[PDB]
Amino acid sequence: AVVKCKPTSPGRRHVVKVVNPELHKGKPFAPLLEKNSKSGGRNNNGRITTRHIGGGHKQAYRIVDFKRNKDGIPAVVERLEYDPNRSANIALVLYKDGERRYILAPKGLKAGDQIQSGVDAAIKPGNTLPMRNIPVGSTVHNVEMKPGKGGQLARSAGTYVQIVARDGAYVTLRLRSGEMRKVEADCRATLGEVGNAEHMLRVLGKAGAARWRGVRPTVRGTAMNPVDHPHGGGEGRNFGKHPVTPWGVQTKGKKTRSNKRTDKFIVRRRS
Amino acid sequence: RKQVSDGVAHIHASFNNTIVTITDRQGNALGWATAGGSGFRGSRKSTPFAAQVAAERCADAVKEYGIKNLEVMVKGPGPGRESTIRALNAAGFRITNITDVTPIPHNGCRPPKKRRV
Amino acid sequence: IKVRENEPFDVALRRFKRSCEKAGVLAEVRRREFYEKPTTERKRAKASAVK
Amino acid sequence: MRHYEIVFMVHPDQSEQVPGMIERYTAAITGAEGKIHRLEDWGRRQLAYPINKLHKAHYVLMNVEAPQEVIDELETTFRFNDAVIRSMVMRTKHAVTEAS
Amino acid sequence: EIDYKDIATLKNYITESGKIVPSRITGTRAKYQRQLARAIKRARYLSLLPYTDRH
Amino acid sequence: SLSTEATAKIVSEFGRDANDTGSTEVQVALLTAQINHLQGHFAEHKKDHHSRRGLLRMVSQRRKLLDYLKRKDVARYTRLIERLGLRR
RNA sequence: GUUUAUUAAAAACACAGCACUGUGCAAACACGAAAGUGGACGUAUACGGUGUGACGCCUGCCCGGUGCCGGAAGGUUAAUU
RNA sequence: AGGAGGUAAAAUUCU
RNA sequence: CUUGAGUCUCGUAGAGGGGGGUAGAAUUCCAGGUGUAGCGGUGAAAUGCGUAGAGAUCUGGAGGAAUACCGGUGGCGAAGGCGGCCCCCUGGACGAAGACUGACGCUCAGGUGCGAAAGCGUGGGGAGCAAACAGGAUUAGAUACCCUGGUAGUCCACGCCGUAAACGAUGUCGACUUGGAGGUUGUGCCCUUGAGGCGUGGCUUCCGGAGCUAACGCGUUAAGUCGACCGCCUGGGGAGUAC
Numbered sequence A: 001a002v003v004k005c006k007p008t009s010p011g012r013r014h015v016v017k018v019v020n021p022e023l024h025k026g027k028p029f030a031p032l033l034e035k036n037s038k039s040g041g042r043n044n045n046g047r048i049t050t051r052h053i054g055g056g057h058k059q060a061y062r063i064v065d066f067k068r069n070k071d072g073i074p075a076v077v078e079r080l081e082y083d084p085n086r087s088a089n090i091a092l093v094l095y096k097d098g099e100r101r102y103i104l105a106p107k108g109l110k111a112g113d114q115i116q117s118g119v120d121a122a123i124k125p126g127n128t129l130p131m132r133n134i135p136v137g138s139t140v141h142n143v144e145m146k147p148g149k150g151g152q153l154a155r156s157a158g159t160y161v162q163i164v165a166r167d168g169a170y171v172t173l174r175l176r177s178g179e180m181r182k183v184e185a186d187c188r189a190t191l192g193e194v195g196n197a198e199h200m201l202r203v204l205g206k207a208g209a210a211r212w213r214g215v216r217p218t219v220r221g222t223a224m225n226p227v228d229h230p231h232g233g234g235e236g237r238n239f240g241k242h243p244v245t246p247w248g249v250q251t252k253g254k255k256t257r258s259n260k261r262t263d264k265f266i267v268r269r270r271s
Numbered sequence B: 001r002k003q004v005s006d007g008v009a010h011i012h013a014s015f016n017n018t019i020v021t022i023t024d025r026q027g028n029a030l031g032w033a034t035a036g037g038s039g040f041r042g043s044r045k046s047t048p049f050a051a052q053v054a055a056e057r058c059a060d061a062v063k064e065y066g067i068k069n070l071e072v073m074v075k076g077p078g079p080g081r082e083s084t085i086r087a088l089n090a091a092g093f094r095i096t097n098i099t100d101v102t103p104i105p106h107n108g109c110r111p112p113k114k115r116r117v
Numbered sequence C: 001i002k003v004r005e006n007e008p009f010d011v012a013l014r015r016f017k018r019s020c021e022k023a024g025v026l027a028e029v030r031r032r033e034f035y036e037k038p039t040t041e042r043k044r045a046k047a048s049a050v051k
Numbered sequence D: 001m002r003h004y005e006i007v008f009m010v011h012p013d014q015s016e017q018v019p020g021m022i023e024r025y026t027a028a029i030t031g032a033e034g035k036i037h038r039l040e041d042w043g044r045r046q047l048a049y050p051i052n053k054l055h056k057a058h059y060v061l062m063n064v065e066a067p068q069e070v071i072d073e074l075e076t077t078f079r080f081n082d083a084v085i086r087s088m089v090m091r092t093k094h095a096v097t098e099a100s
Numbered sequence E: 001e002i003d004y005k006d007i008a009t010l011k012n013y014i015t016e017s018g019k020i021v022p023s024r025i026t027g028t029r030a031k032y033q034r035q036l037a038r039a040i041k042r043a044r045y046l047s048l049l050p051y052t053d054r055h
Numbered sequence F: 001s002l003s004t005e006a007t008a009k010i011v012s013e014f015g016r017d018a019n020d021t022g023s024t025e026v027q028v029a030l031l032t033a034q035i036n037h038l039q040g041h042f043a044e045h046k047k048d049h050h051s052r053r054g055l056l057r058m059v060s061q062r063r064k065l066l067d068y069l070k071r072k073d074v075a076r077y078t079r080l081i082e083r084l085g086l087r088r
Numbered sequence G: 001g002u003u004u005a006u007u008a009a010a011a012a013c014a015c016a017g018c019a020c021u022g023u024g025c026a027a028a029c030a031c032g033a034a035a036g037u038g039g040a041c042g043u044a045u046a047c048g049g050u051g052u053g054a055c056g057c058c059u060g061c062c063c064g065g066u067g068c069c070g071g072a073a074g075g076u077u078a079a080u081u
Numbered sequence H: 001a002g003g004a005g006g007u008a009a010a011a012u013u014c015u
Numbered sequence I: 001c002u003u004g005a006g007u008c009u010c011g012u013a014g015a016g017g018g019g020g021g022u023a024g025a026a027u028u029c030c031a032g033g034u035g036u037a038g039c040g041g042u043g044a045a046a047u048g049c050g051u052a053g054a055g056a057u058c059u060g061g062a063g064g065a066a067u068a069c070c071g072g073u074g075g076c077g078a079a080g081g082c083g084g085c086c087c088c089c090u091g092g093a094c095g096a097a098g099a100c101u102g103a104c105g106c107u108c109a110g111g112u113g114c115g116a117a118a119g120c121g122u123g124g125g126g127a128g129c130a131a132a133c134a135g136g137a138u139u140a141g142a143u144a145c146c147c148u149g150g151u152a153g154u155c156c157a158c159g160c161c162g163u164a165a166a167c168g169a170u171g172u173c174g175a176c177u178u179g180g181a182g183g184u185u186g187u188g189c190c191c192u193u194g195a196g197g198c199g200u201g202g203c204u205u206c207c208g209g210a211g212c213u214a215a216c217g218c219g220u221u222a223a224g225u226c227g228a229c230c231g232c233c234u235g236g237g238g239a240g241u242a243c
Ligand SMILES: [Mg+2]
Pocket: A218
């Protein structure tokens, strides 16, 4: 559900909420979460390594199962929960032995849906197999890069990879980054698309929306003086410079990939 | 080359410049020679005669690899449709079979609007 | 379309050459659009093809 | 209860999943008191044209009377079974019993 | 007709290029010339007879 | 137009015997009965404009002949609408 | 909303929103002769960079110059031999 | 004796 | 009161409308195989495409849009308009016997709703085609017609818009007046005695009498003969404009 909220006040006027009515109202499952302290975007050194980061709400880490290593054992979707730590939504599952876990909720499921994992383990949304066991063309999320190394690929809300070949011992797959890229095929993956793909329909609507999301004012390079940034000073709104990061490198066009150790896995790269 | 003797000639009569190639049974390929840059170029191609001679220069280079026959499927409307085969069976290839391959939709894609000369 | 015909001669054969298709259905499908004038083609190709 | 004529077909290298089907459909239409009035089966049969580049494939038939249902949750059982390759369910027009 | 599986017949209503045949040639009844099409065309869908004649 | 079986039921109580199929009571009853079930059809689909056009005839006609009797045999109406549902 | 603590609170900066661009994760990028660390216990509905600055109607022509993204036939060319 | 397909390019004006 | 009108019964044909499903041919593109200097295009050209290999050809795989043949002075809808196949929901028309109803009618200013294409919003989609835009020609000029490209859009969803030579340029209903060829869809009776013999319904195309008409033409589907009710015109412009 997306809502537009009326212009009761500016910066409500442009707001647009994503309201999920079967997201469990209340407190998440205690034993599956641990503390998670903010950074400011400052590294062990103390300096700002990444900027725009800091301030905004408290946020307890939910430990989601990115591996789905326990094969066999059915598990049942007890409830869907809100997750601060990511756009995606999670699902508190109950394995029939009594174990409990969190999993990246896919487009499909709801309460009571059964799910499981393993070299067979059905083949519906919510179920995880090695890709050496998923049909080509099949639509998947939470893909592994190295087997046993948990999911890394296509995890964001409403995101997905489709497998698209098999080529032997790898298995070429295309990520709606646009890139097709071979990968060892014992690498697992969960059936379905992930999360509320509605995510991107939000609008935020005011400044503070962003502040309590963690993010912080971005100051232009021309708003500054020439000692602060290469977009120089001015004397009344001026430029005449080849756009560039504060540290001197071109922005716009300047390809900056370097990793030949993996260039053996890219096959067609985004456009 | 390696000499089969059994092959096929794929002929494309687009109209405006009309062309012919030859291949093997499962459809590999070995020889164009074609009306365009080959005995004029311009309105004096797209003539049946030019298809004749377009078949000849094909012939005069599509030998070797055996060939002493060929299946002959044909793509096009207009000049060069027949006159090639007419010169093919005259150069002494046993005209095994002929075929239509001109693509006909079950009206599928829009074609291009407004053209009065 | 696919023609094989039997035995001794060379003649490309067929006074049934314009068999089912080519020349004609290629003009139509080729030229361009229509929609209103196949209706005029209609009440002419059988406003005349009465007697 | 109105009649339907059914005529699915499953690929060669699993013809012999033959009767495994039919029965559960009888359990599915006897369970909705609807006599089928003629069955047929005719496996090995070649095709007018290849499909997925494959000649030949197993066939069947029916003319079942049944509820305006099951065909709901049956016409959709041809929407799994990557096994089966094609289908068609037909009008009705009274009962059926001879042709072949 | 009363049947479409009549691939038996039909073949006397469709040319050696795979084309349905004009009702002006075959000279068939109107009401039953349709009943032929919704039944010949039915049957080319599950490949007992082809659409084309080249593949 | 509902089931050929259906309406068999509704001619009773409304009518003095079966095959008394023409008392203004029944058609009204036949109409409403369809309409009501038929509002389901326009829940789903709903952009089915044409089908609706037929509906309103039922509604127009129903109302038109529900007005006819208002002139003849008073309270031969006030003994059927509440018997059915509709006076909004 | 912010700002010249101590002569400038503004039309300046920020803003939500828009676009361009870079990044397949040992991400780009940043702090670090390094180890390591942030980015992020995030994974392209993400993250960084640059410009624009709710919204509405809109955003034309110009790739010669300078940049950036592609190229290969050559011409010219480093250490080296 | 039917159908088919191809045959004229641009070229203003006159109290 | 039953004959105008409606209801019930068993059926008929239909591209009537809405939803979901699936097939088959082609265009484009992606990956390869072979293959060599041309392809494409026009009036003629050139722009463009090709020596990293095009066009041609083969195999394989994407994706979108449209349904050749049936197809036809064919059907269907109130109009706009609707064409592959498949099931689900649903509208109307028509036929036949009999049953019920008993004038329940016709028309309709206001009012309501439907309404091609282009167009607008939000997003999604994008193979072809193609406003705009660009380049090639053409020309005195060429903001064109022609050629290489090409975005909006054309496709979907939901909400707008409400206009067309939206035309048969012919308002709706009913009744009444010679005919000929048909087309198409029913149904009653009579050696299935034919793919019938003899009738009787609804729609429909061409020709045509009387009559009408300014003439063209209309002519049982009227523009003939009548009657109910509605809408509209009062010289060209100004103007379907201003307020
Ligand atoms: Mg910003």
